Write an enzyme that holds these catalytic residues in place. Structure first.
Site, PDB file in Angstrom:
ATOM      1  N   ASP A  30     -67.946 -48.643   2.823  1.00 46.56           N
ATOM      2  CA  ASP A  30     -68.975 -49.597   2.362  1.00 46.56           C
ATOM      3  C   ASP A  30     -68.357 -50.558   1.330  1.00 46.56           C
ATOM      4  O   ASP A  30     -67.583 -50.126   0.449  1.00 46.56           O
ATOM      5  CB  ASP A  30     -70.228 -48.877   1.805  1.00 46.56           C
ATOM      6  CG  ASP A  30     -70.952 -48.005   2.891  1.00 46.56           C
ATOM      7  OD1 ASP A  30     -70.676 -48.115   4.121  1.00 46.56           O
ATOM      8  OD2 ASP A  30     -71.799 -47.181   2.528  1.00 46.56           O
ATOM      9  N   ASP A  67     -74.330 -50.044  -7.220  1.00 46.74           N
ATOM     10  CA  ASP A  67     -73.546 -48.878  -6.787  1.00 46.74           C
ATOM     11  C   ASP A  67     -72.760 -48.339  -7.974  1.00 46.74           C
ATOM     12  O   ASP A  67     -72.824 -47.133  -8.298  1.00 46.74           O
ATOM     13  CB  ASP A  67     -72.519 -49.259  -5.707  1.00 46.74           C
ATOM     14  CG  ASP A  67     -73.120 -49.390  -4.295  1.00 46.74           C
ATOM     15  OD1 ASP A  67     -72.665 -50.205  -3.450  1.00 46.74           O
ATOM     16  OD2 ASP A  67     -74.035 -48.642  -4.005  1.00 46.74           O
ATOM     17  N   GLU A  98     -71.189 -40.305  -3.006  1.00 44.26           N
ATOM     18  CA  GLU A  98     -70.816 -41.239  -1.988  1.00 44.26           C
ATOM     19  C   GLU A  98     -69.752 -42.191  -2.496  1.00 44.26           C
ATOM     20  O   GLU A  98     -68.873 -42.600  -1.739  1.00 44.26           O
ATOM     21  CB  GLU A  98     -72.055 -42.057  -1.565  1.00 44.26           C
ATOM     22  CG  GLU A  98     -71.733 -43.103  -0.520  1.00 44.26           C
ATOM     23  CD  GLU A  98     -73.006 -43.835  -0.105  1.00 44.26           C
ATOM     24  OE1 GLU A  98     -73.306 -44.868  -0.757  1.00 44.26           O
ATOM     25  OE2 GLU A  98     -73.767 -43.283   0.795  1.00 44.26           O
ATOM     26  N   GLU A  99     -69.827 -42.545  -3.770  1.00 46.10           N
ATOM     27  CA  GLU A  99     -68.862 -43.515  -4.355  1.00 46.10           C
ATOM     28  C   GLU A  99     -67.449 -43.039  -4.709  1.00 46.10           C
ATOM     29  O   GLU A  99     -66.603 -43.845  -5.082  1.00 46.10           O
ATOM     30  CB  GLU A  99     -69.428 -44.165  -5.606  1.00 46.10           C
ATOM     31  CG  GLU A  99     -70.603 -45.018  -5.301  1.00 46.10           C
ATOM     32  CD  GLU A  99     -70.421 -45.871  -4.080  1.00 46.10           C
ATOM     33  OE1 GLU A  99     -69.322 -46.447  -3.826  1.00 46.10           O
ATOM     34  OE2 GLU A  99     -71.391 -46.001  -3.315  1.00 46.10           O
ATOM     35  N   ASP A 139     -76.141 -39.632  -3.517  1.00 42.34           N
ATOM     36  CA  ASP A 139     -75.949 -41.023  -3.171  1.00 42.34           C
ATOM     37  C   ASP A 139     -76.644 -41.784  -4.294  1.00 42.34           C
ATOM     38  O   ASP A 139     -77.885 -41.799  -4.351  1.00 42.34           O
ATOM     39  CB  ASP A 139     -76.716 -41.301  -1.892  1.00 42.34           C
ATOM     40  CG  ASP A 139     -76.530 -42.715  -1.387  1.00 42.34           C
ATOM     41  OD1 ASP A 139     -76.958 -42.867  -0.180  1.00 42.34           O
ATOM     42  OD2 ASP A 139     -75.971 -43.694  -2.145  1.00 42.34           O
ATOM     43  N   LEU A 196     -77.054 -44.826  -5.207  1.00 46.25           N
ATOM     44  CA  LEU A 196     -77.949 -45.931  -4.827  1.00 46.25           C
ATOM     45  C   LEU A 196     -77.904 -46.114  -3.324  1.00 46.25           C
ATOM     46  O   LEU A 196     -76.792 -46.431  -2.759  1.00 46.25           O
ATOM     47  CB  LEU A 196     -77.540 -47.257  -5.525  1.00 46.25           C
ATOM     48  CG  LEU A 196     -78.680 -48.295  -5.471  1.00 46.25           C
ATOM     49  CD1 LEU A 196     -79.820 -47.915  -6.347  1.00 46.25           C
ATOM     50  CD2 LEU A 196     -78.219 -49.567  -5.963  1.00 46.25           C
ATOM     51  N   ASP A 197     -79.015 -45.799  -2.648  1.00 43.27           N
ATOM     52  CA  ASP A 197     -79.044 -45.809  -1.191  1.00 43.27           C
ATOM     53  C   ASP A 197     -79.891 -47.023  -0.772  1.00 43.27           C
ATOM     54  O   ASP A 197     -80.877 -47.338  -1.468  1.00 43.27           O
ATOM     55  CB  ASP A 197     -79.703 -44.562  -0.614  1.00 43.27           C
ATOM     56  CG  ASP A 197     -80.426 -44.865   0.775  1.00 43.27           C
ATOM     57  OD1 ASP A 197     -79.615 -44.884   1.729  1.00 43.27           O
ATOM     58  OD2 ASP A 197     -81.743 -45.158   0.849  1.00 43.27           O
ATOM     59  N   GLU A 235     -76.902 -37.770   2.199  1.00 41.34           N
ATOM     60  CA  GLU A 235     -78.043 -38.508   2.834  1.00 41.34           C
ATOM     61  C   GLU A 235     -78.837 -37.561   3.729  1.00 41.34           C
ATOM     62  O   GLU A 235     -80.028 -37.260   3.445  1.00 41.34           O
ATOM     63  CB  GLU A 235     -77.587 -39.771   3.586  1.00 41.34           C
ATOM     64  CG  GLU A 235     -76.894 -40.840   2.682  1.00 41.34           C
ATOM     65  CD  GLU A 235     -76.208 -41.935   3.512  1.00 41.34           C
ATOM     66  OE1 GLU A 235     -76.210 -43.105   3.071  1.00 41.34           O
ATOM     67  OE2 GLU A 235     -75.676 -41.639   4.602  1.00 41.34           O
TER      68      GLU A 235
HETATM   69  O1  LIG Z   1     -78.151 -51.384   9.041  1.00 40.26           O
HETATM   70  P1  LIG Z   1     -78.241 -49.964   9.671  1.00 40.26           P
HETATM   71  O2  LIG Z   1     -77.009 -49.758  10.576  1.00 40.26           O
HETATM   72  O3  LIG Z   1     -79.564 -49.849  10.436  1.00 40.26           O
HETATM   73  O4  LIG Z   1     -78.116 -48.899   8.497  1.00 40.26           O
HETATM   74  C1  LIG Z   1     -79.227 -48.754   7.559  1.00 40.26           C
HETATM   75  C2  LIG Z   1     -79.010 -47.393   6.876  1.00 40.26           C
HETATM   76  O5  LIG Z   1     -77.801 -47.434   6.098  1.00 40.26           O
HETATM   77  C3  LIG Z   1     -78.045 -47.000   4.765  1.00 40.26           C
HETATM   78  O6  LIG Z   1     -78.069 -48.175   3.963  1.00 40.26           O
HETATM   79  C4  LIG Z   1     -76.981 -46.094   4.099  1.00 40.26           C
HETATM   80  O7  LIG Z   1     -75.727 -46.645   4.425  1.00 40.26           O
HETATM   81  C5  LIG Z   1     -79.405 -46.304   4.789  1.00 40.26           C
HETATM   82  O8  LIG Z   1     -80.095 -46.432   3.581  1.00 40.26           O
HETATM   83  C6  LIG Z   1     -80.152 -46.927   5.974  1.00 40.26           C
HETATM   84  O9  LIG Z   1     -80.983 -45.956   6.573  1.00 40.26           O
HETATM   85 MN   LIG Z   2     -77.690 -44.432   1.459  1.00 43.62          MN
HETATM   86 MN   LIG Z   3     -75.162 -45.480  -1.678  1.00 44.98          MN
HETATM   87 MN   LIG Z   4     -72.868 -47.282   0.632  1.00 50.06          MN
END
Ligand SMILES: O=P(O)(O)OC[C@H]1O[C@](O)(CO)[C@@H](O)[C@@H]1O
Ligand SMILES: [Mn+2]
Ligand SMILES: [Mn+2]
Ligand SMILES: [Mn+2]
Ligand SMILES: Nc1ncnc2c1ncn2[C@@H]1O[C@H](COP(=O)(O)O)[C@@H](O)[C@H]1O
Ligand SMILES: Nc1ncnc2c1ncn2[C@@H]1O[C@H](COP(=O)(O)O)[C@@H](O)[C@H]1O
Ligand SMILES: Nc1ncnc2c1ncn2[C@@H]1O[C@H](COP(=O)(O)O)[C@@H](O)[C@H]1O
Ligand SMILES: Nc1ncnc2c1ncn2[C@@H]1O[C@H](COP(=O)(O)O)[C@@H](O)[C@H]1O
Ligand SMILES: O=P(O)(O)OC[C@H]1O[C@](O)(CO)[C@@H](O)[C@@H]1O
Ligand SMILES: O=P(O)(O)OC[C@H]1O[C@](O)(CO)[C@@H](O)[C@@H]1O
Ligand SMILES: O=P(O)(O)OC[C@H]1O[C@](O)(CO)[C@@H](O)[C@@H]1O
Ligand SMILES: [Mn+2]
Ligand SMILES: [Mn+2]
Ligand SMILES: [Mn+2]
Ligand SMILES: [Mn+2]
Ligand SMILES: [Mn+2]
Ligand SMILES: [Mn+2]
Ligand SMILES: [Mn+2]
Ligand SMILES: [Mn+2]
Ligand SMILES: [Mn+2]
Lengths: 326, 326, 326, 326
Positions: free
Chosen positions: C59, C65, C88-89, C109, C111-112, C271
């Site tokens: 990412d 983050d 995650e970081e 995680d 910040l998700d 996650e």
């Molecule tokens: O853009 P995509 O491929 O649908 O991914 C969205 C997903 O990725 C995330 O941002 C985590 O990487 C989740 O929060 C979310 O469910």
């Molecule tokens: Mn996430």
């Molecule tokens: Mn995150």
């Molecule tokens: Mn990320």
């Protein structure tokens, strides 16, 4: 960088304690933030005015008195750290129900500075905490210990900012409430009062009632015999604000006995002792004029005591005048 | 139910004005909320301490002094309501750049109560607003008008709650800042002071410097000739807090001339006049001892004046003692 | 009436625990309030944008983050409840220094919803907590446990309001952050998901990559064979927001394997497992399509897993299609 | 550095206007902060749930619907800027009482995203503002103007942060609410949408109802004929959140007519027109599929219209498919 909870845990971490004290202070902080929130908008919440009764020492009861009393009592019960509660607002000690009973006795003034509420001057909350000693069922008598037995004491000051000042065996620290994240954050570490200050704080409206020692003492503040500059006068009229300034600027705060009040006005358990303990942990002194506040053995949870406190050379000077007039 | 902006608009709605005043007060409110926010967590922002210079009247400059000065000046410029700014913090009047120039002159003390900042006692902001009269280019002289010419004055009090007190031709109203939605909300409408109070407020550390009228007056407060109860003493040490309490509880606040200061300490333009105008709009009186504060024609933007203010029977009593000693 | 701390203490009060869990969650709450505060004004703090590196799963790293990672790591260290931290970081697990070492392993995680930060859509924080089992020195391997071993998991949702959802052995509860006093307050007790919902949530931009079971399943949502009304589609694009809605409204959330990603995208440790544990404690199901998320034994702290979760009759319906295409 | 009020005043400063618009937006900001405050703690205030009636378009009425409707109506009356109010919540236009009557007509959706309230997803407020044109007594007909006549429009987004997006003749700007001082602060100046994006946003639960152009368009997003990467799908399910993301990231948002709804769902006056005006001021396009949203002359204050909006090359591509199927 350091919250009150972090600080206290990293401390009892040493005393090797059971974390009860930490729960007790966590809970109190929650009460304190809630009172602070209501206070900073009391008029919008319609919280100015009386609640329509008279308390044990004879104060007319204000709305914030009631609100703040209920918050403190509730959070202290739910902490599992306490067994006996003494509040300025309640005639008798409140025993905590067995299932929530913890080892500490807490004496507190849930909102101090009543006379200053409606004119928006600083007000505060004061607390002192004792370990239950007896093995008896918990009762009012567990609160009748001298201040010298305090394990922790201090106060929340709802002033220009909200400060939590917390004294324990090793010293005094100040924590400021950050309204944004609602945490108390360490801002002053191991506070010590100046040995001598240059502010005196007393209600001079009682001049005609003061004994000769207080009278002589005030006169020397106004006309120093050694020709120094006279002390500045300050009297906010809320004990928490005046004592706090005495702490951070030094000098002396007085609510002595007078001709109408052989024992002064302020209450030993939940006004005088917590402030004397703070002052002594900061290197200051707290006396009635004739004995150390912290050594008085109370016989009444609502008893009064004279108090003179602050920088030790200021208080000592006043002690020497009492001795002189003895 | 009613915000400060709503209130003032529904008012000038009458004066049939151009809405400039309303912009001016809107802007000021924004400054005031910002200062209030910083103040309620100043220690966390490291905003206690000096900024390292001396101002025109000789005050050592604090960090909040600087921050609050910049906020007020900036919001007032950007309001399009002003042309000349006088601040306690600036040696000379600040002329506003033509493109942002509006019709009002504003004299203000961006943070009042310096001595009380670090001990977390109430502090405030004071302002008074004049219409530019001359048609000359705007200059320092447009601020040299007597207080009797004020169109609006008042103060923000950062106390237990933050209050904006705003006096205009028809009366005085209090608006409390609701920290949650950041609006000032009307809480006290058409405030009037009691005719007579029972609190006196002066720094008695200056006893040795007071003239005989102040001296006699204080002595009568302590030993009333008619045997009534003596007045209570209060002296918070921040003008805004002491004057505010005088307003809502009645009584008298004094910073008289004394032997070292023939003109007292407090500044005519941005401390004394705004408070005298508030007091007079509440039915109170404000005098030097010999003349009405509001009638003095200033010759200096930083000039000092003695001030005695509050309930008219209290102030009148003190006037009669001056007359007596005249 | 009941804060998160009160609730959890009155709980472990039963499990008769050492209060470590309670410290752990107290600390996390502080991180969570701080992140919430920054998030609700991120643009004013200039906190949008990248921080200029790539993390382990690839990412691009955002400023929030970094900020949120440092807050969580710091508060977890200082809690004395933890010994191994997986974020995650960070490429590798962080071992906690002996003096602050506690018994719990925390995978999180910080910040998700990265992709949703700059357009101000809901984002969140996710955590799952394991008891260290081995007696070895703490190491990365202590985080390699299946989700079935979680003692606690849940997430903070920075949405229209900030909610802390906390699942432990007995059930799921929601606590809403009151910004005024900065406490999380219980608002939903013992949450259970509906058995069947009527919303499906998947990124259909991946249509060309979906396996035949997902493909058939989506088609049945749009053209129900029994003639019922078609399911509504929702896809906020932040896992925390979509899963939260699945919890309180029922239905199904899918991030399946696809032709380019045999193991889906979302990370097993911090996650998928915390959300599967929440869902299972609410009576819902969480599968990869072929096995229960919570039973997978990880070999890599950053490993990915397919996840399909929510109402058990919805997930079961999709399981039966996979079985069918098996 | 620049608040919404400052910005708008420094603007009409040019249009040489009467400051009415500025009052109107000041007032609205106050409503908006108040709704934002309630929203960020709605569950603690018990504000989730229905209010127990059905509105004109047939929506079941939520508690926040009522609260937010009353706040907006009230602040708009008291602004002295308005004469006719159209709200999604009221069957008929509300005429403002003569004494508070101003020149503007305001159409608004006081809380948009009803379906997303209880799951804490982004919700918002939408407004569009017209100058009264006729000289007739103000009546419902003054709201029946095409969107092309808007003088100002935009929306408040209660998302991860609260944003006020305000479009007027010269462009679009974003202002973020700083919860601390309760001011909206400029964070994005003269916003322009990308010419082409890579996210499509539609409820695919309506697949069986879509016309052949929408059907073909979605299929091309999933299987691009030129072999580029397929578009990402996003559908938060609150118009304000989805449109906002379309603005700052580019791409397309669709709520087309379908077999059950020849005019789509979303309301022309207070959903479609304000968003089409924002989009057009950002260089984007807003169509029904066959005509520009902003050119439709309404006959009903609650009438519906299909809307497709966002990046002009995305919308144009969809227009060409409609033309093709025409
Ligand atoms: O853009 P995509 O491929 O649908 O991914 C969205 C997903 O990725 C995330 O941002 C985590 O990487 C989740 O929060 C979310 O469910
Ligand atoms: Mn996430
Ligand atoms: Mn995150
Ligand atoms: Mn990320
Ligand atoms: N967090 C703490 N900080 C300082 N002293 C503490 C702390 N916790 C406990 N103590 C002291 O050690 C004893 C046991 O503490 P506790 O059992 O943790 O309440 C108490 O009587 C306190 O005097
Ligand atoms: N909102 C208001 N409330 C009270 N008086 C006002 C107001 N606006 C203007 N005035 C008075 O009327 C004159 C014109 O006001 P204005 O031009 O609106 O600043 C000013 O000098 C004020 O004394
Ligand atoms: N506050 C609590 N609520 C629920 N369970 C707890 C709590 N505290 C501890 N436990 C459980 O009991 C064990 C001991 O808890 P503790 O030692 O207090 O962290 C932990 O592994 C938890 O699974
Ligand atoms: N603050 C402002 N910013 C931009 N345009 C404005 C502003 N005030 C007024 N206008 C425009 O000029 C006309 C007169 O504005 P007003 O009379 O100030 O409401 C209005 O119809 C607006 O279209
Ligand atoms: O008005 P007096 O008699 O000076 O009493 C003021 C004192 O009373 C108290 O309000 C408590 O009753 C203190 O806070 C303060 O120090
Ligand atoms: O310490 P003193 O001499 O009593 O002065 C206090 C006064 O000075 C001020 O701080 C302004 O200089 C006022 O706010 C207050 O009334
Ligand atoms: O559930 P649907 O049919 O996709 O409708 C969602 C739309 O409805 C609205 O809630 C307004 O009714 C919009 O905010 C949103 O765009
Ligand atoms: Mn009392
Ligand atoms: Mn008291
Ligand atoms: Mn009290
Ligand atoms: Mn000064
Ligand atoms: Mn001052
Ligand atoms: Mn000053
Ligand atoms: Mn609706
Ligand atoms: Mn809507
Ligand atoms: Mn609506």
């Amino acid at each position: 960088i350091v919250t009150l909870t972090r600080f206290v845990m990293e401390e009892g971490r040493k005393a090797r304690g059971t974390g009860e004290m930490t729960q007790l202070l966590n809970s109190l902080c929650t009460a304190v933030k809630a009172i602070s929130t209501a206070v900073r908008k009391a008029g919008i919440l319609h919280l100015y005015g009386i609640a329509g009764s008279t308390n044990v020492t004879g104060d007319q009861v204000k709305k914030l008195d009631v609100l703040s009393n209920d918050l403190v009592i509730n959070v202290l019960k739910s902490s599992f750290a306490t067994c006996v509660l003494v509040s300025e607002e309640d005639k008798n000690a409140i025993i905590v129900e067995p299932e929530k009973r913890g080892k500490y006795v807490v004496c507190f003034d849930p909102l101090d500075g009543s006379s200053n509420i409606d004119c928006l001057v600083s007000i505060g909350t004061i607390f002192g905490i004792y370990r239950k000693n007896s093995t008896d069922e918990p009762s009012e008598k567990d609160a009748l210990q001298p201040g010298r037995n305090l394990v922790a004491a201090g106060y929340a000051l709802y002033g220009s900012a909200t400060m939590l000042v917390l004294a324990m065996v090793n010293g005094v620290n100040c924590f400021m409430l950050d309204p944004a994240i609602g945490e108390f954050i360490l801002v002053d570490r191991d506070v010590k009062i100046k040995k001598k200050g240059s502010i005196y704080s007393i209600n001079e409206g009682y001049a005609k009632e003061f004994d000769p020692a207080i009278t002589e003492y005030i006169q020397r503040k106004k006309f120093p015999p050694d020709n120094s500059a006279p002390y500045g006068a300050r009297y906010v009229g809320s004990m928490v604000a005046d004592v706090h300034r005495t702490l951070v600027y030094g000098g002396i705060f007085m609510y002595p006995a007078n001709k109408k009040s052989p024992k002064g006005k302020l209450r030993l358990l939940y006004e005088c002792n917590p402030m004397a303990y703070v002052m002594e942990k900061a290197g200051g002194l707290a006396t009635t004029g004739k004995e150390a506040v912290l050594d008085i053995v109370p016989t009444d949870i609502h008893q009064r005591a004279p108090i003179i406190l602050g920088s030790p050379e200021d208080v000592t000077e006043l002690l020497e005048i009492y001795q002189k007039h003895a």
